[PDB]
Amino acid sequence: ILHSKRANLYYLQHCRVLVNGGRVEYVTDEGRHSHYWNIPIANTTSLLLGTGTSITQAAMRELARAGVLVGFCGGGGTPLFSANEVDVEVSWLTPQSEYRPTEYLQRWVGFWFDEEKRLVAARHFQRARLERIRHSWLEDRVLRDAGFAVDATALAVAVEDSARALEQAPNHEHLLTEEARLSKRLFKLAAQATRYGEFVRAKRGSGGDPANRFLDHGNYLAYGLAATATWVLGIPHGLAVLHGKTRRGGLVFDVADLIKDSLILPQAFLSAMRGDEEQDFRQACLDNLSRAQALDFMIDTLKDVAQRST
Template sequence: MNGNARRRLTAPTLAMLPRVADSLSFLYAEAVRIVQDDTGVCARIESPRGADRISIPTAALSCVLLGPGTSITQAAMATFARHGTTLVCVGAGGVRSYAGIMPAALTTVWLEKQVRAWSSDDSRLGVAVRMYERRFGSAPAGATLAQLRGFEGQRIKALYKLLATKYQVKRFRRNYDPEAWDDQDPINKALSAANACMYGVVHAAVLALGCSPALGFIHSGTQLAFVYDIADLYKARVTIPLAFSLHASPDPEREARRQLRDNFRAYKLMPQIVNDIQHVLDPDAAGSVGDRTSDLLHLWDPTAGPLPAGVNYGFEADIVDPESE
């Protein structure tokens, strides 16, 4: 077998890459050192009896939320990248998302679709409407964006009232103030913690598809605008009911994270997040583009379309070498 044939056989294709939809959930880490050892990636925790090591199932995780006091070695980061696991740096308890580290070997198919949809007011409006339709199940025909925002606001207020009655909560008002975190009631603490974890997982899904977290269609002005767009699709069904169910919990933040991990597995939310991102960007291509086997790198041509990279096209075009004149 010659060298060129061997390189073609070993060249990475999309089919070889881990699919984010196959990942189970997320892992929140705080005050640990994540290292690579002979058996895989593990979290090393210092205790009075010495250092304990807990194995991390890298291939089964969509993302790892790196909280305060967490350090990670380069070798461990490389393993996460090979398995398609995204690393997201977050604040205490998973609240606030600061940065995401994504694998380099990603196709730009969905990024290009996102940019095309975002760059035109008409197509951007179409994506925003599909997002509201995803939340409602359906949207009133001909409703403006302002009307859809109003419908969503009324829906959330009604949901708060319904859940407050169900759990016998006398009064609830949504409040998120990081500067006065300890003064908030258990529902607000649980909701903020659950939403932050939801943002981390959605952030991982957005990065794993190669999309830009900054190019939002409803939200704008932040590097996580698209993350907030997608996360809003699930709050009414997942994080808000979960937060109200923890109204009497002594540790609502920790319990919210634990139960949300279980919910991600039970509801199979990661495949749904991937499918919803694809659907709102391009309904016709959802579920198909991104799973096909193709070269990861190609050349753009406005007429011929994608062309294979790594090919010398010097003899295929009618060109004049300036040095030959």
């Protein structure tokens, strides 16, 4: 249930959170034996209330006493609906509320306005993304066994070439387009491996074939996971690195990018070819995300870029 070992983030489902006798208690079908009792309550913990759960104001009081962030997310924890805002660590605020302020916003803003540094960040994002493609498509054979048998030499050549291109070109405007070309080739490779036939990527949900729908669902979950990552870091969604400065919710899409083609896309084609239900697809996606430590990776990346930007 520990959703991110890097963030001390826990997912609670099928239980009520209430305060009896001055201690926050979980009313669950397992009673005393539920693992929720092992939840450490400290300023380092952060909760994610899941499906079928409710919380009492008294609990909110006790958690605030202990300084524990709370957030509501849907099935499996991908769509993050609402959460507590996290503080910002600077010398002029200084409340004693015992809430672990986080300093990453200052680091982010310290460079966000300098375009050259912003570009350097974009490059760093894409380096990470490609290396996660090469990892999941080649190094690990779980997909191979599942049925996603694809050629390697063509994929390796394409990825090598795109990586070679990343280290070049002057502005965001090229990077976006280079990624788009890589995207197209990856789609073609996946369709060939899946024997799905010809594939064309419609957008704004105009597609009707299973592949398109499953891609949309997968991307929706990925966005939710990224939103969780940013919220844990406290960075507002508007300070995008690679998407346009006017794009509402740009940053989450920047962060979501580092898994779409690594983990969502193959599963979308696999499930479409296998003829799965939408529910089966959702469960498979969440299982893949859990297996890959996705949230932890996207946390590590954001921290790495912050430290590297100095």
